């Protein structure tokens, strides 16, 4: 059951990269945003091992979380990549640099508010570990030391920093769950 879902995890990684390829970046060994160079933006065969195992860890954690929640939308049904690909990649094309697997295109599936709540819970876990990183290291905020002004608006991982500010993460999760529903 892992291999068929491993293909979907690779497809989700492709979704993330062609979501950021279309911004206008380029393949590069040095991670720069304005200079258009990201090691994770390079082709699949030359991806760094650190980011690849981070992607694998996030994948397995997401499967465990969604199995705990009870939103099984894969494995049992046929997967949509490579040999049973749903031709989503060749459907739409963009002229930007990088690997360019051609951007996503999926209009055969819709979304349900149950998966919206599952997106909310995934955001709960993501902002939980984010706030753990911020608080354990004292980064982006400070009461005694005040490392930088304009402390983290979250503090509480989801109560104060609503989806209106984290629109990038919200749209990424929405596209991820739409693609997962379209996978099978």
Tally Cβ neighbours within 10 Å of residue 65: 15
Q: How many residues does the chain have?
A: 184
Per the DSSP assignment, residues forming a β-bridge with 126 are none
Q: Entry resolution in angstroms?
A: 3.7
Cα–Cα distance for residue pair 128/134, rounded to 1 Å: 10
Using only C-alpha atoms, the chain has a radius of gyration, in whole angstroms, of 18
Of 106, 115, 119, which Cα lies nearest the Cα of 73?
115
105-144: b or e for each residue (b if 16 or more CB lie within 10 Å)?
ebeebeeeeebeebbeebbeebbeebbeebeeeeebbeee
């Amino acid at each position: 059951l892992e291999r068929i879902r491993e293909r979907l995890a690779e497809n989700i990684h492709e979704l993330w990269v062609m979501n950021k390829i279309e911004l206008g970046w380029q393949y590069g060994p040095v991670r720069d945003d304005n200079k258009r160079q990201h090691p994770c933006l390079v082709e699949f065969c030359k991806l760094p091992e650190q980011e690849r195992n981070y992607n694998l860890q996030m994948s397995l954690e997401t499967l465990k979380t969604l199995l705990a929640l009870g939103c099984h939308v894969g494995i049992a049904d046929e997967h949509a990549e490579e040999k049973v690909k749903k031709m989503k990649l060749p459907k739409n094309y963009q002229l930007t640099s990088g690997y360019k697997p051609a951007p996503m295109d999926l209009s055969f599936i819709k979304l349900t508010p149950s998966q919206e709540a599952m997106v909310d819970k995934l955001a709960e876990n993501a902002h939980n570990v984010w706030a753990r990183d911020r608080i354990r290291q004292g980064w982006t905020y400070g009461i005694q030391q005040d490392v930088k002004n304009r402390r983290n608006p979250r503090l509480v991982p989801y109560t104060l920093l609503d989806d209106r500010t984290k629109k990038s993460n919200k749209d990424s999760l929405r596209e991820a769950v739409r693609t997962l529903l379209g996978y099978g």
